[PDB]
Design an enzyme around this catalytic site. Structure first.
Site, PDB file in Angstrom:
ATOM      1  N   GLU A 400       0.824  -1.207   0.000  1.00  0.00           N
ATOM      2  CA  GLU A 400       0.000   0.000   0.000  1.00  0.00           C
ATOM      3  C   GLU A 400       0.859   1.258   0.000  1.00  0.00           C
ATOM      4  O   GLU A 400       0.512   2.258  -0.628  1.00  0.00           O
ATOM      5  CB  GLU A 400      -0.936   0.026   1.212  1.00  0.00           C
ATOM      6  CG  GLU A 400      -2.007  -1.057   1.249  1.00  0.00           C
ATOM      7  CD  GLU A 400      -2.660  -1.314  -0.095  1.00  0.00           C
ATOM      8  OE1 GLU A 400      -2.956  -0.344  -0.826  1.00  0.00           O
ATOM      9  OE2 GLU A 400      -2.895  -2.499  -0.409  1.00  0.00           O
ATOM     10  N   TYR A 441      -0.576 -11.403  -9.198  1.00  0.00           N
ATOM     11  CA  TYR A 441      -1.432 -10.246  -8.982  1.00  0.00           C
ATOM     12  C   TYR A 441      -0.826  -8.987  -9.592  1.00  0.00           C
ATOM     13  O   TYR A 441      -1.543  -8.065  -9.978  1.00  0.00           O
ATOM     14  CB  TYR A 441      -1.688 -10.033  -7.489  1.00  0.00           C
ATOM     15  CG  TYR A 441      -2.552  -8.829  -7.205  1.00  0.00           C
ATOM     16  CD1 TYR A 441      -3.788  -8.683  -7.818  1.00  0.00           C
ATOM     17  CD2 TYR A 441      -2.130  -7.836  -6.332  1.00  0.00           C
ATOM     18  CE1 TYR A 441      -4.583  -7.583  -7.569  1.00  0.00           C
ATOM     19  CE2 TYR A 441      -2.919  -6.733  -6.074  1.00  0.00           C
ATOM     20  CZ  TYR A 441      -4.142  -6.610  -6.698  1.00  0.00           C
ATOM     21  OH  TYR A 441      -4.933  -5.513  -6.446  1.00  0.00           O
TER      22      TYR A 441
END
Ligand SMILES: Cc1cc(S(=O)(=O)N(Cc2cccc(N)c2)[C@H](C)C(=O)NO)ccc1F
Ligand SMILES: [Zn+2]
Length: 489
Positions: A400, A441
């Protein structure tokens, strides 16, 4: 006093039970047994172009869907992945959710006005919850609170999906992983119930991977109501202090005993608010920030409360250890400039204001392990869940932060347009070349590829850092150049 204890609690609430209107009785049944969507209603609503797509979709394959959702969609089809089918699934998953009062309360942590569902259903939840509250007016009393324990069996995954995956010994399922057990209990001191606990008057055998066996002592003023077949429903918004966590054996199989004591919720919210001040003072000083900058926010409302608080220290320590302090300082100051937050929570991310104030479309709202919201410049980290192909919450936090780095770097390049640096022509070409060379991903898009590479480049496992250098050399070079540029500016 197995049957005696049951009879006297039933006797205590006998008038309360008899005075229940059917409306109230239906409310309590609806609460114990949520209303599943009718599979035949859903299918009738579809157009076969969608049904054609729905058949083409491999339901058991997706990482977007829960196990409960997967089963229902697998059962329904009996009658990578494109941009359109995901868009389809984003809308469809909204129409397949059970009407579940206790799930709504847990997801929001009691903040039921959170715009994470349709307004009409939101108001229906609000009404039922207020009506249930009004039913639970009778406290357990000072005669009973001391003579009685109440019991609750729980799946570990409701508290921590990450540790839950390894709790049971894979070699021998009769045994508990001692190492995992230790991690689980280590910082488990208090707990919050934001929904209505349904507890047993007498302890039950543990069925279906419910290795957590709570023994709960009620407070005298704890409001409750008797339920059929030896159960009690407790008021929402109560606090629980953890007195003891031990490995116990029942019928030659190992379980975890959790002894807890009901205390006022205000008492525990105080601890959380003090801890929030403590962690902000630690990190304001460490980051060279103003003494009263509020960067770290605890949004804590559920049953693994103390661990969310304590793990926030460990997460930020790992973050500090694996990333250059200068980079950490420049990027964090940019976040503080935009009133950004580090939000650690145990409610679902759609119910966090840092996201929902900027995302009005519910089908566009995201729940996951972690999230970065540029509009609010905030990192959101959800404790209870398990991120896809993440080892822990720390690796999750760093990914993040990579987004925030992406954000800040793009800002520095063009202060007027303030796009992401991953939207630049230069990086898009690099993504086109090296996009499939790292994590599965990371293939998703430019932003994800950048964040995944950033995370891997700052892993505790130095074999991971060298792997990025070897497999995605241009990405590696680009990111290191972004870091230099950020720090030197
Ligand atoms: C690998 C990874 C995944 C996640 S995640 O929370 O699961 N995550 C990805 C994800 C993938 C598949 C399903 C979900 N519902 C979420 C979110 C959306 C994300 O990319 N945040 O920026 C966070 C951090 C990570 F390092
Ligand atoms: Zn991401």
């Amino acid at each position: 006093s197995r049957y005696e204890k049951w009879e006297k609690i039933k006797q205590h609430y006998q008038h309360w039970s008899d005075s229940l209107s059917e409306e109230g009785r239906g409310l309590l049944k609806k609460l114990q047994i949520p209303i599943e969507p009718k599979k035949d209603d859903i299918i009738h609503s579809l157009s076969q172009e969608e049904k054609e797509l729905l058949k083409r979709i491999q339901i058991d394959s997706s990482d977007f869907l829960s196990t409960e959702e997967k089963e229902f969609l697998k059962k329904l089809q009996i009658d990578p992945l494109s941009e359109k089918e995901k868009e389809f699934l984003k809308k469809l998953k909204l129409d397949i959710q059970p009407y579940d009062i206790n799930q709504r309360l847990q997801d929001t942590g009691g903040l039921i006005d959170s715009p994470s569902i349709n307004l009409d259903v939101r108001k229906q939840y609000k009404r039922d919850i207020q009506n249930i509250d009004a039913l639970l007016h009778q406290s357990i009393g000072s005669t009973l609170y001391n003579k009685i324990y109440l019991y609750e069996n729980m799946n570990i995954n409701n508290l921590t999906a990450t540790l839950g995956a390894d709790l049971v010994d894979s070699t021998d399922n009769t045994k508990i992983n001692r190492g995992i057990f230790n991690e689980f209990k280590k910082n488990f001191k208090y707990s919050i119930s934001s929904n209505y606990m349904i507890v047993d008057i007498n302890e039950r055998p543990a069925l279906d991977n419910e290795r957590l066996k709570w023994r709960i002592q009620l407070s005298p003023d704890t409001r409750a109501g008797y339920l059929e077949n030896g159960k009690l429903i407790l008021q929402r918004n109560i606090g629980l202090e953890i007195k003891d966590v031990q490995i116990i054996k029942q019928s030659e199989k190992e379980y975890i005993r959790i002894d807890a004591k009901v205390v006022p919720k205000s008492k525990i919210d105080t601890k959380i608010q003090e801890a929030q001040l403590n962690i902000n003072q630690e990190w304001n000083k460490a980051l060279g920030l103003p003494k009263y900058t509020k960067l770290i926010t605890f949004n804590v409302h559920n049953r693994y409360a103390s661990n969310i608080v304590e793990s926030a220290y460990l997460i930020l320590n790992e973050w500090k250890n694996n990333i250059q302090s200068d980079l950490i300082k420049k990027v964090t100051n940019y976040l503080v400039d935009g009133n950004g937050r580090f939000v650690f929570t145990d409610i679902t991310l759609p119910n966090i204001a840092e996201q929902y104030t900027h995302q009005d479309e519910i089908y566009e709202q995201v729940h996951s392990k972690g999230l970065y919201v540029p509009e609010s410049r905030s990192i959101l980290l959800h404790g209870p869940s398990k991120g896809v192909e993440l080892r822990n919450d720390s690796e999750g936090f760093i990914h993040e932060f990579g987004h925030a780095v992406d954000d800040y770097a793009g800002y520095l390049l063009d202060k007027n347009q303030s796009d992401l640096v991953t939207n630049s022509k230069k990086f898009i070409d690099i993504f086109k070349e090296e996009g499939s060379n790292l994590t599965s991903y990371g293939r998703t898009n430019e932003a994800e590829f950048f964040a995944e590479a950033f995370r891997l480049m700052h892993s505790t496992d130095h074999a991971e850092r060298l792997k990025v250098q070897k497999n995605a050399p241009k990405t590696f070079q680009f990111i290191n150049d972004q870091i230099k540029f950020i720090i030197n500016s």
